[PDB]
């Protein structure tokens, strides 16, 4: 992926995360905890659905018989028709291959981008109160309970409240 | 110390897809874009089909026994079959494929009399090759003959004006007797000449005694235009002419009809029913179809790269 | 205390465009990629046009009265009209559409006498369908017939060598008389056969009496190569042959000409003047044209995503 | 887009920024002020122009008539021609739709990228003298007058000059 | 590129780096040194290889003769063939030009991405021990010898080991 | 003490094109359009047939030029410019359709149709086809009356295809030098030839005055019968043809070379390439890269080149 998050600095995905595409996992004095993030999950699915809306359910042009299976037309016209049919097949097989390969490249990078953006969102949210682990985690330098973990997840965390406690925990 | 970790979901067994960079990279989910599922049926729901069976598409114009039930028909989906046959007496149509192509998209045909009446000649020429209940002939045509063996056929003119607001499909035949004496038997002795003339068409025909065949020719006669026939024998006269109804799709297949499924894309082996952009079923299709590709499968990723443990 | 913010521009209402993942997303500015503006005229500025009017393109070769003014012409833009006609006497050109395609890109035609003189026959064959300074005939053709009614038309041979460095367009006609009686009156009784041979062409023709008809046939005669005509009647002889001038475009249209605009792309509805890669005006075009597409509009984003103040 | 600046961490665009694509809005004791960034703006315009040059003004392909609109040709060959023309129409309509959709996708992300670059450039510029507030602003931890703001915009800001004042304003502990 | 490293905040490339696409140039008390990085170089090379795997060595479908050089075919069909061929050529000419242009755009951005990834990895490694100067360099705020520089390249760099020294060096006036 | 990150560069970079830029410089690039032609027909691994003076359709009827190719077997048929189908004036109807089915035939095998005659002559010959004196097409029989101006008897000849594959049936109509000539070789009065199989029926009349023999053909299904009925001006098949398998047909002036492999052929030789495109020839046969108008289309295989 172009952004280096998914299959990058984040080791692996979570099989337990059944509720969404992206999420948070926290450890504190109360234990483990996993919760899915709605916004980034919905952003990614909307973009995947948009690709599908483009490719699936297209209106097609009508094409008629220019041949005759039961009454062979002169081989001269038949071979011309066949050359053209094969030439069309060549183009569409090329286009399809390229379209799918190109879309898949974009889909993978798009999802990697969403992970990165959420990671960046949290980083800026935590300010001076945390340091990044390098593996997708933030080492928080203040006591942070389940209510505190929730405030981070839904963008209501106030860094000012913990700045003094965090800064002295960071400077030792 | 306390920590919060960000991450993404994964599955135990993902789906291998192709990118510009990698072949067989695993993603969470993928969806097929190439239709491979065929229906071995002609899906005719919401459509008015005509399965011509033993009747050849050109036969609907002249009327051999096999085409009696299709002399006038109305449909938006005309299905031709391998066993379909145009003629009963040996002979052919001039520019047959061109004629077949306009008939397939006609929406069927309506027939109208041309008001041709004859006297001083016979009208009931028949052959064992076209049997209805004994020797018969093309239902839409008249095999004109002299009053008796070796009698002179009269020089005849027959004109027909198209009274409708659409082109009339005018058909006529030329009889090539099995011998010179056979031509003398049915018509007068001497050279026979058939001229067919409209304001956009002019052609003359001479019989070729010995060929034992009836060759059919055709024109499209514009509204208000007149087609004039001049002949002195060997002339297979039209009794009726055809008018097209509207729009239809022509199909060639061996697949049975099925009115319980809907479909817009037809081929030799039936119907392709799909919303997918591409199909790998048949390169030769008719109707509104996904584009044919040579790949069996092209999977579109619908999820992120899959990385599990 | 003090702070500095980074940001980008926006507008009140932007333009909807399509992307791979989203339909109708709004951007600051977009530009049209599909041309829909048609000029209902043939733009002939910078060009030497030839409006054929009542004369058919193939008529310029054989010379019916309506084509008198086009027997020889030079142009890079040939305009065909619906009322154009190739013939006076009933008849068809074999391979007529191939010949039209050739003439459309020829740059025009120049005529040269084939030097055919005749003995023991008449040359003054004529019809009231091609009336012009007398009940005449096709201007580039000679209607050959016997010296008197019913006289035997001599077995004849005429050869022509192309003396130029470019292909000669050779035309001839086979006359199909109104009746067997007429054919005997004009060319004498018996079988009639016409043979035309060059180094890369050989065909025989028999008249088909019954329908008043003069059917025209043609070949391209290579430089230095000879065309040979052997015949015993029912033959319409070429008096002149044609030579092409260079390069041109051929249009079928009813749109009037306009010399005050330049165009390189033409169709039946007129002219497409555009630098866009695509057009939705007409699928049948001639010249240097944008590709025909079925979409009415495809907007190309020329700015960022538009995010107005909520 | 892919980079999360435009329609991402930056809430909205500035309708008052009429002299560029990207800009700075500052706040100090002297007041407010907005100035466009030329370098980032031109970089985005040059790339967009590049796409335009590749599509508009391009040399067209040569076309000739194979059909006849007045004296219709034989039905068989005419149907082959029509089939082929419609197949061309199908390919070109597909190509056109895809080209524009792909280009538009890249144009949006490209613009998003330039905003991201300019942001990250200023961040590195300010060093330890400022903090990101998450909305695309940097809160500066020293007095930064109009000329100080100017040095940031024109890339001459020397972080050494203010580091001492900044650090004792940021680190508010012993 | 989209990522702003190559031809961006990193001024220029190094002609002296011949053992890879990306790498590290360090300055300390022992002098300077330059070492290439296998991981990001290989990741870039493999992705470009993948692109070549797609375009090179394709299986092609068979086409037969439909016209005749030595004896001209009927002129109407010849014109249709020629008209069809030109149309084919235009499509393939368009496709080839678009493919190359699109692939190259992605290739450049891809390499830019790999440079950015490596930079961001090293930033996370050094934690609070280093400050970035804006030109792609990290100012290490402690004595970091050749063997210490090694560990940064090797991903074995323990930041806790130098944290106290570097922190008090960053605070001093 | 500092650690700096960076990337490689070269002095001489390659200019390539992208979506946003023209002639942008990269570290390295690879050509995608093939321009190297081989001025040879590469026939290694193949069984080739260089027809030379013999026209492809001539192999069916057998003029002097084609005596070497009455039965040939190959997977690569090379037609030459100086190839000729006939000796006596005339042509094949649907000639190109016949050429196209022959080019992929894999060669032809010949089988006797087993026609015997009495009451007529079968030894017709012309100085136009010399093969040690006057002769005729080696696979055909020129049927005449027993003597000058003698009546040619009404005749019927039938042949059933015994093999498990279609039979190529050729016959000819002789259009005499004159009306006098026709009655000399055959009887007086109108001549008619009718040819019938269970899915083909056609009659032919001669066209006296235009000295020529025109050949006509049909494909006869296994277990089906051709019937010839004729009273003169008829050129009879002595042998019918059966296709051997599969072949590719090429038109070229390029010499054969058995020392190189190739699968893409054109008038100017062979295109050997793994590249997706080629700028050598727009008209090719076999398995080829696609033809493009561009001479060069370089694919970047390296990053942007930024020198100091
Ligand atoms: C053009 O292609 C069609 C479709 O393949 C050919 O028709 C088929 O011929 C093959 C091989 O002889 C058979 O297996 C099929 O049964 C035929 N029919 C269909 C409907 O597939 C046709 O022969 C080709 N035209 C020419 C002139 O070769
Ligand atoms: C091929 O397509 C053309 C145009 O789509 C057909 O000609 C047109 O037919 C329509 C509807 O019947 C007429 O109103 C137009 O006047 C025709 N010409 C044009 C230029 O639009 C044509 O009939 C088709 N070919 C065949 C053989 O059916
Ligand atoms: C730059 O790319 C070229 C291809 O354009 C590479 O050339 C190939 O190099 C190998 C040797 O390593 C040869 O075996 C091939 O024959 C070459 N192929 C072609 C098409 O020339 C070259 O390796 C690259 N240069 C560098 C320095 O990496
Ligand atoms: C926006 O694009 C249009 C073309 O659609 C053009 O007229 C104009 O120059 C562009 N710029 C602005 C600021 O409107
Ligand atoms: C088609 O193109 C070939 C080769 O360019 C040319 O020789 C020929 O004249 C063209 N055919 C017709 C019928 O115009
Ligand atoms: C994803 O796509 C597959 C195949 O198209 C589909 O069957 C499945 O329901 C989808 N998976 C999930 C988890 O929704």
Author numbering:
A (entry chain F): 1 to 172
B (entry chain E), C (entry chain A): 10 to 142, 144 to 158, 158A, 158B, 159 to 220, 229 to 261, 263 to 276, 276A, ...
D (entry chain B): 1 to 174
E (entry chain D): 1 to 173
F (entry chain C): 11 to 142, 144 to 158, 158A, 158B, 159 to 220, 229 to 261, 263 to 276, 276A, ...
Task: Show the paper's wording.
By using x-ray crystallography, the structure of H7 HA from the NY107 virus was determined to 2.6 Å resolution. Although five asparagine-linked glycosylation sites are predicted in the NY107 HA monomer, interpretable electron density was observed at only two sites, Asn38 in HA1 and Asn82 in HA2 (all residue numbers are based on H3 numbering). At these sites, only one or two N-acetyl glucosamines could be interpreted. NY107 is regarded as a low pathogenic virus, and as expected, was produced in the HA0 form. However, subsequent digestion with thrombin protease to remove the His-tag resulted in cleavage to a profile on SDS-PAGE comparable to that of an HA1/HA2 form. As expected, NY107 HA is structurally very similar to the Avian-H7 in all comparisons and closely related to H3, the other group 2 members used in the analyses. Although the NY107 RBS is similar to other subtypes (H1, H2, H3, H5, and H9), a previously observed specific feature of H7 HAs, is also observed in the NY107 150-loop region: two residues inserted at position 158 result in this loop protruding more than 6Å towards the binding site compared to other subtype HAs. More interestingly, the eight amino acid deletion, only found in the North American lineage H7s, from position 221 to 228, resulted in a complete loss of the 220-loop. Sequence alignment shows that Arg220 and Arg229 are conserved in all influenza A HA subtypes, but structural alignment of NY107 HA shows Arg220 occupying the Gly228 position, and the much shorter loop turns at residue Pro217. Indeed, due to the absence of 220-loop in the NY107 HA structure, the “aperture” of the RBS formed by 220-loop and 130-loop in regular HAs is increased by ∼10 Å, so that the branched, internal, and perhaps more complicated glycans might be accommodated more efficiently.
